[PDB]
RNA sequence: CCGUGAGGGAAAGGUGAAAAGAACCCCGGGAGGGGAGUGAAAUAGAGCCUGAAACCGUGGGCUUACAAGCAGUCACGGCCC
RNA sequence: CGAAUGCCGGCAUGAGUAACGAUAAAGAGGGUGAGAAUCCCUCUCGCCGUAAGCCCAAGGGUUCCUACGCAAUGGUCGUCA
RNA sequence: UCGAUGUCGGCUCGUCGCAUCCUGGGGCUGAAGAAGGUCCCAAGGGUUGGGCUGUUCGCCCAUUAAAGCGGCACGCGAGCUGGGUUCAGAACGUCGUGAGACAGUUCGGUCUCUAUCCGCCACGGGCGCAGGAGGCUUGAGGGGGGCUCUUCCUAGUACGAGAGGACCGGAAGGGACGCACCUCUGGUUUCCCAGCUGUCCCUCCAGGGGCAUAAGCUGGGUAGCCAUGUGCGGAAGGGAUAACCGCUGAAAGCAUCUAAGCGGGAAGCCCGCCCCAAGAUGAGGCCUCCCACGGCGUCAAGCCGGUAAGGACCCGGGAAGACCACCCGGUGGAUGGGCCGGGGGUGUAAGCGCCGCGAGGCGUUGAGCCGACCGGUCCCAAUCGUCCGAGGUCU
C-alpha cells in the first residue's frame, strides 16, 4: 500500500526494453569423446564420465 | 617474483640471535635510552613478561614491571639495539602463552602463579657452559 | 569486505562441523557421494585429512578421527581398509566430479566424491 | 626520470640505527624496456617497462621481439614509465639510490561494494535513542525540491578501491640489489603481491 | 589517549587526587591529548589541606596514559593509570614533588622539570 | 460466500440437424496434442455458436544504438508492397 | 459514453521484482516412480522434553484407515498429503 | 496546493552566496614595535569540545588563528529522531454558572519492509569508431586535494616618551582533514588452540563429542579487514590577475598607474600534484598479429558457409568481485584442494612410566593440534572440447 510506488505503467517500450537482457543464455554442451552425447564441460554425464569414469549402467 | 616472504627474511640481515629465548618468564635488563645529547644511556627494566608476540623478525614482547606506584608495561622489539637482555628467573611455568592476567590482579597472586618453571630453570642452568677446562687442550 | 580469506560456508559453525562429520560418515562408508559441488569442494579438504590422520596409524590419531566420526565401527572400517588402501598416496585422496542430470527442481550442481582406487 | 615496474611483497620494520623505519618491499625488479615510446611518432617521451619473463607460450600476438633483449613478453603486463628515456637496457634499481623520493602508484586493495560510512567515512547515524534502519546510512543525499536533483559530485556507497593511487614522496630507504629488491618507508599501495610503478619524485 | 572527560590520577603534591581532563591544549580542534601534551583539568578529587582546591581549573600535563605511546624507536610504553601533574600556566609544575613514573617525551615536549624531578623517567 | 445474529448475498445460458460427443494409431506418465474418423462446417471438439477490444505472442515490410519528447502534424527524401 | 477516487467483467503495469510465513538444521545410501532436496526405509546430525510429548473436555465433523489417483489445494516439487 | 505542499529543533549528508569570523593580500590610521581600528580585494580551505534549554537563538565553561552571517520548502522525516508542537487521557493557574478554553505550563502519547521514471553512486550487456584483434597510452573534458598553528634562528637586534617586541626569510615540530597500508601498537578473528562447567552419548576408567549468545562460557589468537597505528599529502614552481603600489607619459608645455605601453602583486584564477577519462560520434595516436573470392545479379555479395590472429563458452580460482565484469590459470600446468617444510597461533597432546590414599604433580614434551600466511610437491581437481571470429568494393 505504501511508501514506494510506481508513478506510472511501465509501457511496452520499456517493460520490453527491459525484458531484454533477462534473454536465456543457451547452455554449453560437448560431444563427450566416448560416445557423441552432448555432455556439458567438465561432467560425467550419463555415458561413460571421464576415461575410466563411474558408471551408471555399462562394463 | 616467487618468493614473496623469502624475500622477506633474506631482506632481514637485521635480526639478531643472541639474545635469549625465553618464554614468558622474567627478563631483567637494559635498553638503548638515548637522550641528553650522549647515547651511552643504558637503563635496566625489571620486570615479568607478559607477551611474545611473534612475526619471526620483529617479534615484540611486553614486560610489564609495577615501578614505585603502579604497572608499566614495556614492549620492546627485540631486534633493535637492545645490549644484554638476560633473565633473572626462567620462571612461571606459564599455562598462559600472552599472560595478560596480572593486569586486574597485581599483588601476590603474581607470586602464587607464575610459581615456578623448574625445568627450564634447571636446564638453562645445568647449560653451564663456565667449567675450567680451558687453556689445557 | 570479507574473503580475503579461506574456507566457504552456509550454515553456522556448529551446523558447518556436523555437516562435514555427517559427509564423512558417508563417504567413509560408501565411496561415492553426491552432493552440491560447494559442499563437495569443501568435503575433500576434511575428508583428506581424515584419511591422512588415519595413515598415522597410532592410537593418538585414532582418537583425532574419533574426534570428528563419532562412530568407532565405522573408524575400524576406515583403520584396516581405506588407511592401508593408500599408503603411498602423499596428499590428495578424494576426487569430486561434476554432474549433469542436476538437481533438478532447485538446479543445483550435483558433484560426485569418490575416493580413488 | 628515474621509473621502475615492482611488486609489493610485504612490509618490515627495519632500523636506522635509532629508529624503526617502518618499510615496505617493493621487488622492484630488472625490466626491460620493451618499447621506447619516442616524442616524434607519439608525443609521449615514455617508455613501455616490462616484467617476470616466464610466459609458456601464453605469449599470443604481441609477441613482439623487436627489442634486442625483449624477454618474451610478461605476463606480469607492460605498463609506462611516463617522462622515462633509459640509457643502456634492462633498468634495474641502480637509477634508485638510497635517500631519495619516489612515487609509489599501485592499484589498491578493493572493498567490493563498501558502501558509505566505509567509503566516504561518514557519521552514519546514532546507534541507539531511536530508529534503527538507518544506522549506516548516509542519510540526507540533497535538498528540496531546488534544487531537487543529487548534485552530481555526491558522496554514495560504490565500488571502494582497486583504482590506481599514488603515495607521494616516499623514501627510498635501501636498495638490495644483490636481488633487485627496492625498500621505501611507508605504505606502498596494493596487496602484497600486487604490482606498483615506482616514479620520480615530484618534489621538484 | 586522554580526552575531555578523563580522570586523571594526579601525581604531585597540590591537593589534586583526581582531576578531569576539561580540554586538552593542542592545536584548534584536538581530539585527544596524548603523554606529554597540556590538558585544561578541573580538580574533583582533594587532599584536605591541599593547595588547589576541589573546583580549581587548572592546566596539566600528562605524565602517564593507559595508552601506549609508540616511541620513534619501535618499542612503546605503556603504564597503568593516566596521571597528570598539576602545572602553573607558564607551563612550570605547581606541587614541590611528584610520584611515580613518568614518560620520557617529556624532555622533548619541554618539561624537564618534570623529568628531574620524577624519581623514575620510564 | 460473508455474518454470532438479524441479515446481506453473488456470478454462472447457448457443440451441432442429430452425440454422429472422436473407434484405431503416434508422442506423452497423464493432460494435452498430430494423424484417422464424424459432420455441411471440428480455428462448431465439450462449461464447445458468433467470438470484438484491452492484453500477450510469432512471422514479414520500414525504422532506429550522438540523441531531446503532450509523442503529433506539415514538408520534402529514402526504402518494400 | 471518456471521465462520476463511477459499477461489473477482463487484462495489464508494478515484476519475474518483494516474498515463500520463525536464524530448531540438515547430510548421505538404497528403494518406488515416467519424473524426486520434498514420498518410503536405513544410518548419522539437530530440536522440544511443565513440550514442539501423552490423555480428556470445548469445538470441528469423516479430516480416521486402506486402496487407486495427482488437474486442482499444499506459497516450490510431489508418486506424498 | 485543503481528492493533503508533514510541521520546529537536533542527527546525517551537504552545497552555495559574500554583505569575511579566521587564514592570504592591501590602503589609511589618532599605525613607535607588538597590537589593533576601519575600509578595499578575497570563499580556496576552514569555522571546536562542552553545561543549560525541545530549542533555532542565547547565556556561560575551556580552548582556538576563527569558533562567520545566511540561503538551499526557516535545506534535509519515500533518510532518522519526536524532545517540542497540532490528537484523544490527566493535572495545575485562570476564565467560564457550565460543557469546556488558553503559542500558559505539566506528565503520557502508533512518525507508514519493497523505488516505476528522473537524479546520483557504482558495475555491466549491446553496438559504434569502413579492415578484424592483443596490448599500451596521449588527455578534450572533468573530479579530488586545496588548510593552519606553535616553537626556534633571524635578534630578543630594528623600533622603542619605551623594556614589550617585529617586518624579510629559513628550519623543526604539532592540530585536525584526506589517500594508502599491517611493519609496529591495538581491535576483531564464528572453531585455530587451550581451560572449565552441567548434562547426555560414544565404550565402564581414561579420552572425546553433542547442547547450553545464531561461539556454552572463559583465556589467547596468525592471515584478513581496521584505527587509536603507520607512511604520505596540502605545496614548491610557472603564467595571467583583483584590490593596492608602480615606471614611462601625453590629453591640458606642469602630473597622473593610463588613454599608447609595460611592471609588480593575493591561500584567490589557469596550469602544475593525484585520480577517472576516446560513447572526445571530435569516437584519437603508437607497437604488434591475421588477410580471399570459390560462390547469385545493374558484382569481392548488403547475405551466408568454411577462415586465421584472437576472443568467448566451460572449468580451477583470486587481497577482483552482489551478479556480470577485471585479473590469473587449464596438463607444457603450481591455479584451487590435499600432503610436506617453514612462519604463525596455542601452550608440555595422547599414551606410558614414576610420586601421591586422592584432586593432581611429574618426565617423555614447546610437545601436540594447527584457518587462511610464505613456499615446495601433479597427489586430486582445471579431461574433453564446442562456438564466434576478416576476407575492406569506397577521395
Ligand atoms: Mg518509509
Ligand atoms: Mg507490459
Ligand atoms: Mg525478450
Ligand atoms: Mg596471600
Ligand atoms: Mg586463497
Ligand atoms: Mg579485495
Ligand atoms: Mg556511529
Ligand atoms: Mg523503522
Ligand atoms: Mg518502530
Ligand atoms: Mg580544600
Ligand atoms: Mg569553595
Ligand atoms: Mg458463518
Ligand atoms: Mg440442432
Ligand atoms: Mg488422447
Ligand atoms: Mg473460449
Ligand atoms: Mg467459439
Ligand atoms: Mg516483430
Ligand atoms: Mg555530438
Ligand atoms: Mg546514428
Ligand atoms: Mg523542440
Ligand atoms: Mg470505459
Ligand atoms: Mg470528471
Ligand atoms: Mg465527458
Ligand atoms: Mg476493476
Ligand atoms: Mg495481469
Ligand atoms: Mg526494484
Ligand atoms: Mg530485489
Ligand atoms: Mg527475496
Ligand atoms: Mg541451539
Ligand atoms: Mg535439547
Ligand atoms: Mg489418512
Ligand atoms: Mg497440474
Ligand atoms: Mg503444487
Ligand atoms: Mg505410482
Ligand atoms: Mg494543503
Ligand atoms: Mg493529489
Ligand atoms: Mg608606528
Ligand atoms: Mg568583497
Ligand atoms: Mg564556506
Ligand atoms: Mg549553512
Ligand atoms: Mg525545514
Ligand atoms: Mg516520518
Ligand atoms: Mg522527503
Ligand atoms: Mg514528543
Ligand atoms: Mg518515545
Ligand atoms: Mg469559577
Ligand atoms: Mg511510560
Ligand atoms: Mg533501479
Ligand atoms: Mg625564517
Ligand atoms: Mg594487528
Ligand atoms: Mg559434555
Ligand atoms: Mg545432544
Ligand atoms: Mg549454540
Ligand atoms: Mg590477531
Ligand atoms: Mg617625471
Ligand atoms: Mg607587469
Ligand atoms: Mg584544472
Ligand atoms: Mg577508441
Ligand atoms: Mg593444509
Ligand atoms: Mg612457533
Ligand atoms: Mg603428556
Ligand atoms: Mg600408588
Ligand atoms: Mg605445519
Ligand atoms: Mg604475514
Not at chain 2, 620483529?58 to 644484554?84: A, C, D, M, W
Not at chain 2, 586486574?104 to 627450564?120: G, T, V, Y
Not at chain 5, 596521571?83 to 612550570?92: C, D, F, G, R, S
Request: glycine share 8%.
Amino acid at each position: 500500500a505504501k511508501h514506494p510506488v510506481p508513478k506510472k505503467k511501465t509501457s511496452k517500450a520499456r517493460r520490453d526494453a527491459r525484458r531484454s537482457h533477462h534473454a536465456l543464455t543457451p547452455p554449453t554442451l560437448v560431444p563427450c569423446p566416448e560416445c557423441k552425447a552432448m555432455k556439458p564441460p567438465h561432467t560425467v554425464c550419463p555415458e561413460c564420465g571421464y576415461y575410466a569414469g563411474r558408471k551408471v549402467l555399462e562394463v | 617474483m616467487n618468493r614473496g616472504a623469502l624475500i622477506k627474511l633474506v631482506e632481514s640481515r637485521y635480526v639478531r640471535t643472541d639474545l635469549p629465548e625465553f618464554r614468558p618468564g622474567d627478563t631483567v635488563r637494559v635498553s638503548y635510552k638515548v637522550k641528553e645529547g650522549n647515547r651511552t644511556r643504558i637503563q635496566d627494566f625489571e620486570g615479568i613478561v607478559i607477551r611474545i608476540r611473534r612475526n619471526g623478525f620483529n617479534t615484540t614482547f611486553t614486560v610489564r614491571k609495577v615501578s614505585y606506584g603502579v604497572g608499566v608495561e614495556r614492549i620492546f622489539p627485540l631486534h633493535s639495539p637492545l645490549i644484554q637482555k638476560i633473565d633473572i628467573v626462567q620462571r612461571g611455568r606459564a599455562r598462559r602463552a600472552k599472560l595478560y592476567f596480572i593486569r586486574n590482579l597485581s599483588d601476590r597472586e603474581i607470586r602464587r602463579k607464575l610459581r615456578a618453571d623448574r625445568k627450564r630453570i634447571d636446564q638453562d642452568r645445568a647449560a653451564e657452559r663456565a667449567a675450567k677446562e680451558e687453556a689445557q687442550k | 569486505r570479507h574473503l580475503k580469506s579461506g574456507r566457504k560456508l552456509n550454515r553456522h559453525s556448529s551446523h558447518r562441523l556436523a555437516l562435514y562429520r555427517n559427509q564423512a560418515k558417508s563417504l567413509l562408508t560408501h565411496g561415492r557421494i553426491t552432493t552440491t559441488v560447494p559442499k563437495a569442494k569443501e568435503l575433500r579438504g576434511f575428508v583428506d585429512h581424515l584419511i591422512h590422520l588415519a595413515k598415522r596409524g597410532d592410537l593418538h590419531a585414532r582418537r583425532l578421527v574419533l574426534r570428528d566420526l563419532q562412530d568407532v565401527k565405522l573408524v575400524r572400517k576406515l583403520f584396516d581398509e581405506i588407511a592401508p588402501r593408500y599408503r603411498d598416496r602423499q596428499g590428495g585422496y578424494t576426487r569430486v566430479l561434476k554432474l549433469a542430470e542436476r538437481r533438478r527442481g532447485d538446479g543445483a550442481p550435483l558433484a560426485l566424491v569418490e575416493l580413488v582406487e | 626520470m628515474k621509473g621502475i615496474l615492482g611488486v609489493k611483497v610485504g612490509m618490515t620494520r627495519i632500523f636506522r640505527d635509532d629508529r624503526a623505519v617502518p618499510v615496505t618491499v617493493i621487488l622492484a625488479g630488472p625490466c626491460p624496456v620493451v618499447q621506447r615510446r619516442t616524442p616524434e611518432k607519439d608525443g609521449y617521451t615514455a617508455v613501455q617497462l616490462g616484467f617476470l619473463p616466464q610466459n609458456p607460450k601464453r605469449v599470443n600476438r604481441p609477441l613482439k621481439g623487436h627489442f634486442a633483449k625483449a624477454g618474451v613478453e610478461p605476463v606480469r603486463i607492460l605498463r609506462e614509465i611516463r617522462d622515462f628515456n633509459p640509457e643502456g637496457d634492462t633498468v634495474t634499481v641502480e637509477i634508485f639510490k638510497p635517500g631519495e623520493r619516489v612515487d609509489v602508484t599501485g592499484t589498491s586493495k578493493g572493498r567490493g561494494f563498501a558502501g558509505v560510512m566505509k567509503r566516504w567515512n561518514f557519521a552514519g547515524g546514532p546507534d541507539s535513542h531511536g530508529a534503527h534502519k538507518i544506522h549506516r546510512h548516509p542519510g540526507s543525499i540533497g535538498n528540496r525540491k531546488t534544487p531537487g536533483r543529487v548534485y552530481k559530485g555526491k558522496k554514495m556507497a560504490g565500488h571502494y578501491g582497486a583504482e590506481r593511487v599514488t603515495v607521494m614522496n616516499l623514501e627510498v630507504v635501501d636498495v638490495i640489489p644483490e636481488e633487485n629488491l627496492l625498500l621505501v618507508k611507508g605504505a606502498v599501495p596494493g596487496p602484497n603481491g600486487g604490482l606498483v610503478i615506482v616514479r620520480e619524485t615530484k618534489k621538484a | 589517549m586522554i580526552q575531555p572527560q578523563t580522570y586523571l590520577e594526579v601525581a604531585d603534591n597540590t591537593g589534586a587526587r583526581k582531576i578531569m581532563c576539561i580540554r586538552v591544549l593542542k592545536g584548534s580542534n584536538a581530539k585527544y591529548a596524548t603523554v606529554g601534551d597540556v590538558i585544561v583539568a578541573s580538580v574533583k578529587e582533594a587532599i584536605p589541606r591541599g593547595a588547589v582546591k576541589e573546583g580549581d581549573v587548572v592546566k596539566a600535563v600528562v605524565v602517564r596514559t593507559k595508552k601506549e605511546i609508540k616511541r620513534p624507536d619501535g618499542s612503546a610504553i605503556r603504564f597503568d593509570d593516566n596521571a597528570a601533574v598539576i602545572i602553573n600556566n607558564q607551563l612550570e609544575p605547581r606541587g614541590t614533588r611528584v610520584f611515580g613514573p613518568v614518560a620520557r617525551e617529556l624532555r622533548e615536549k619541554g618539561f624537564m622539570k618534570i623529568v628531574s624531578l620524577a624519581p623514575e623517567v620510564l
